[PDB]
Amino acid sequence: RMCMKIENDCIFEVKLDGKVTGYACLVGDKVMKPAHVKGTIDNPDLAKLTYKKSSKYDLECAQIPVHMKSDASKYTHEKPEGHYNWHHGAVQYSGGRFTIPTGAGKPGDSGRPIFDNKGRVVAIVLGGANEGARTALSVVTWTKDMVTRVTPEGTEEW
């Protein structure tokens, strides 16, 4: 219930020719859009921004307008081992891996946050690789200072 309201305020939708292709969540002061997500953001002001691209981290960012910084979601660098939250249910972070039940991620849908139990963004999801009953997630995540994209073998950009 509670974290979904944070997601509903954080998320904005990327449309290609009018068709949903992914999302660009406002995190801190960054509009975190994955680079693989085709098309343009639906918000008329987020479409005005100029984005710093990255092929390595598969990520785009820009300073959000000063109007948006109240709506943008809180982040944290803290990723303790345990239980985390996501739109398609709940996530486990263990062994340094975000992991999810098989098929809970779907093509498109990229750019969803993962939240801690306080509703703070901890990662941006890029895809996942199935391993029996569980999939690991391809994820943008970050330390104190830097992004450190995680991307296991056999992953797909769902």
To the query of whether residue 58 is one of the catalytic residues in this protein, the response is yes
Catalytic residue among 58, 73, 87, 138: 58
- Write out the DSSP string of 33-97: EESS--SEESSTTTTTS--B--TTTTEEB-BPPTTGGGTSBPB-S---SEEEEETTEEEEEETTE
- One of 5, 38, 48, 83 touching a second copy (CB under 8 A): 48
In 10 A of CB 135, how many CB atoms? 25
- One of 1, 44, 66, 81 touching a second copy (CB under 8 A): 44
Catalytic residue among 9, 36, 54, 88: 36
Q: Which is nearer to a second copy, 23 or 98 (CB)?
A: 23
C-alpha angle 48/52/56, rounded to 5°? 140
Q: Could you tell me how many residues of this chain bind a second copy (CB under 8 A)?
A: 7
To the query of whether residue 70 is one of the catalytic residues in this protein, the response is no
To the query of whether residue 36 is one of the catalytic residues in this protein, the response is yes
Catalytic residue among 109, 110, 116, 138: 110
Q: Is 45 in the site for a second copy (CB under 8 A)?
A: yes
**Tokens standing for 54?**
């990255």
Q: Which is nearer to a second copy, 68 or 90 (CB)?
A: 68
- One of 17, 81, 145, 153 touching a second copy (CB under 8 A): 17
Q: Is 18 in the site for a second copy (CB under 8 A)?
A: yes
How far is the C-alpha of 79 from the C-alpha of 66, rounded, in Å? 28
How far is the C-alpha of 86 from the C-alpha of 103, rounded, in Å? 14
Q: Is 19 in the site for a second copy (CB under 8 A)?
A: yes
Please tell me whether residue 7 adopts helix, strand or coil conformation. helix
| Residue numbers annotated as active site | 36, 58, 110
